[PDB]
Design a protein around this ligand. Structure first.
Ligand SMILES: [Mg+2]
Ligand SMILES: [Mg+2]
Ligand SMILES: [Mg+2]
Ligand SMILES: [Mg+2]
Ligand SMILES: [Mg+2]
Ligand SMILES: [Mg+2]
Ligand SMILES: [Mg+2]
Ligand SMILES: [Mg+2]
Ligand SMILES: [Zn+2]
Lengths: 52, 77, 191, 189
RNA sequence: CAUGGAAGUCGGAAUCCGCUAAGGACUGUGUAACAACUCACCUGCCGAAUGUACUAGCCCUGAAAAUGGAUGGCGCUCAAGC
């Protein structure tokens, strides 16, 4: 098992992210536009699917 | 307490909205016990609050509990 | 649209000295000395008052003015580091296989080296060497901590990121395998 | 901003009718504390506070109704209130000073003075001894009651109280904070 | 109303008033049920702007073919481009 606080710390770096719908890039949780140039800085973002 | 007749058992499983009561000084008389526990500038504020407090009962006949309290035309006591 | 005058100010406490020459900044105080080169930015440095440094840009564009605030905080970071230092903390996160580290001392030079063993039960021994001026310690306050401290924020932070980026899980669901070493707190040595 | 209009006429009407105005400096005091003093002083005097009146008292200075209003302009800085009353200065000097509350710590609150627990018997259930062992306090259970044999320093004056100690301060009924009404200088007294 | 138990927060149906500058018969978290906690709303600090929706200029994404290669060539960036 993993201590509850440690599991929260690790999840911040690889679980709470936004995903672009055009180039599958990882984005910050509060982002509004993709940062990559090959997708044209698109603003079609979706949350990262949770584990359940 | 001012409810339609008795609240007989095994009758509250279905809708129990048959609690209509009359709107008169009987409800106003019961307001004197509280006596405006929190300020309210004596029973004058409490009477308006208590009158509209029974909003489910919809007062008596055509008159509505909100209209009586909203219309400041009745005597203080 | 070009802006005529954009200005910022940096206060200087009465403990250290700073000197700028040919856009090369040298900051020296009680805890040491640092240098930074800013020859790639067109900025005019000046002495506003007895203990205040001013900097400004004339007839700049929107893109050029943006760098003005970036320069100010970088120099402020240098002042903080020489009088208060910096301090980072890291934690170990494992489910089954314990992670073993060995922070051996100076290797005939100022550099520290960190050895990481038994990551998710692998036989690699993986080695990272820290930048000079950075000291790595095993904490005694509580279990599973790495403490990094130094004078410059850029060196301390980049070295800490080196350790985090080296412990990676491949060909697995990373939402389930949360193994690794992560940073958890940032602050100064003093207070 | 319907209530905004109601503030303008209310402020100007009440200031002129009462010749005596008293300024009160209340800061970080629980709302219930003002509730009781409002009810206690309900019969005599009305207390009313709002946002700073940058031009609302300055408007009272323009007309010659009170040449002394413009003398009181610079005294307002922030979170300073006014009291409208008709009573004597001496009777209202300490009237609003009642009900000083005992504010507990908030997990890190700076204690102005060193706080000490005198030796004695807590008298509480001995299942809570784990809280004492967190700070490493030497405690002996006597007759089912936790007893502090030797005084242990909690936190130095001016230092942040530990989160466990701050919670521990609640059941011991000891805290460094006492919140009460603040009296500011009024009318160059 | 509901009830081994539901005190805003299983659920069903209503939405008033006191005190105020402001705090909802409440958006969540949470208790067997209370509590505790968050939000909403208002106040203290600062010093002049801020928010949403549309129009069209240059530039960028959309833009994958077979011998080595063509604004005519070199080269050009407050142009030697529009
Ligand atoms: Mg697989
Ligand atoms: Mg093109
Ligand atoms: Mg060509
Ligand atoms: Mg071409
Ligand atoms: Mg030509
Ligand atoms: Mg030209
Ligand atoms: Mg030509
Ligand atoms: Mg031309
Ligand atoms: Zn993208």
């Amino acid at each position: 098992i993993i201590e509850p606080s440690l599991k929260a710390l690790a999840s911040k770096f690889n679980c709470d992210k936004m995903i672009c719908r055009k180039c599958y890039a990882r984005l910050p949780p509060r982002a509004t536009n993709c940062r990559k140039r090959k997708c044209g800085h698109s603003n079609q973002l979706r949350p990262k699917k949770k584990l359940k | 307490a001012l409810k339609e007749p008795p609240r007989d058992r095994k009758k509250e499983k279905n809708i129990k909205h048959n609690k209509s009561v009359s709107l008169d000084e009987i409800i106003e008389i019961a307001r004197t016990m509280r006596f405006k526990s929190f300020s309210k500038d004596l029973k004058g504020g409490v009477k308006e609050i208590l009158g509209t407090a029974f909003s489910v009962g919809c007062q008596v006949d055509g008159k509505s509990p909100k209209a009586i309290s909203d219309a400041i035309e009745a005597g203080e006591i | 649209m070009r802006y005529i005058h954009s200005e910022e100010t940096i206060p200087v406490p009465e403990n250290l000295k700073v000197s700028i020459k040919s856009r090369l900044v040298t900051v020296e105080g009680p805890r040491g000395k640092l240098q930074k080169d800013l020859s790639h930015i067109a900025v005019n440095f000046s002495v506003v008052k007895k203990g205040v440094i001013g900097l400004e840009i004339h007839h700049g564009s929107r893109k050029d003015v943006a760098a003005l605030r970036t320069v100010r905080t970088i120099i402020n970071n240098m002042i903080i580091g020489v009088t208060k230092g910096f301090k980072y903390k890291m934690r170990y996160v494992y489910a089954h296989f314990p992670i073993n580290v060995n922070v051996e001392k100076n290797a005939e030079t100022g550099c520290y080296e960190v050895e990481i063993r038994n990551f998710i039960g692998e036989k690699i021994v993986r080695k990272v060497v820290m930048a000079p001026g950075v000291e790595v310690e095993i904490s005694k306050a509580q279990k599973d901590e790495l403490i990094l401290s130094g004078n410059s924020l850029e060196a301390v932070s980049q070295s800490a990121a080196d350790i985090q980026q080296i412990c990676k899980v491949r060909n697995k669901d990373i939402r389930k395998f949360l193994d690794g070493i992560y940073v958890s707190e940032k602050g100064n040595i003093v207070e | 901003s319907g209530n905004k209009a109601g503030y303008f006429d209310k402020l100007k009407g009440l200031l002129e009718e009462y010749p005596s105005i008293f300024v009160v400096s209340v800061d970080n005091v629980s709302s219930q504390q003002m509730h009781e003093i409002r009810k206690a002083l309900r019969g005599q005097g009305v207390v009313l506070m709002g946002k700073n009146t940058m031009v609302r008292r300055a408007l009272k200075t323009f007309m010659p109704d009170h040449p002394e209003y413009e003398r009181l302009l610079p005294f307002v800085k922030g979170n300073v209130g006014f009291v409208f009353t008709n009573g004597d200065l001496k009777e209202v000097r300490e009237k609003i000073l009642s009900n000083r509350i005992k504010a507990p710590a908030r997990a890190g609150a700076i204690a102005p003075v060193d706080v000490w627990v005198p030796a004695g018997n807590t008298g509480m259930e001995p299942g809570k001894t784990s809280f004492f062992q967190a700070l490493g306090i030497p405690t002996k259970i006597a007759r089912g009651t936790i007893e502090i044999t030797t005084d242990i320093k909690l936190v130095e004056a001016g230092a942040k109280v530990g989160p466990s100690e701050a919670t521990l301060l609640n059941m011991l009924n000891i805290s460094p904070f006492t919140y009460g009404m603040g009296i500011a200088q009024v009318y160059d007294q």
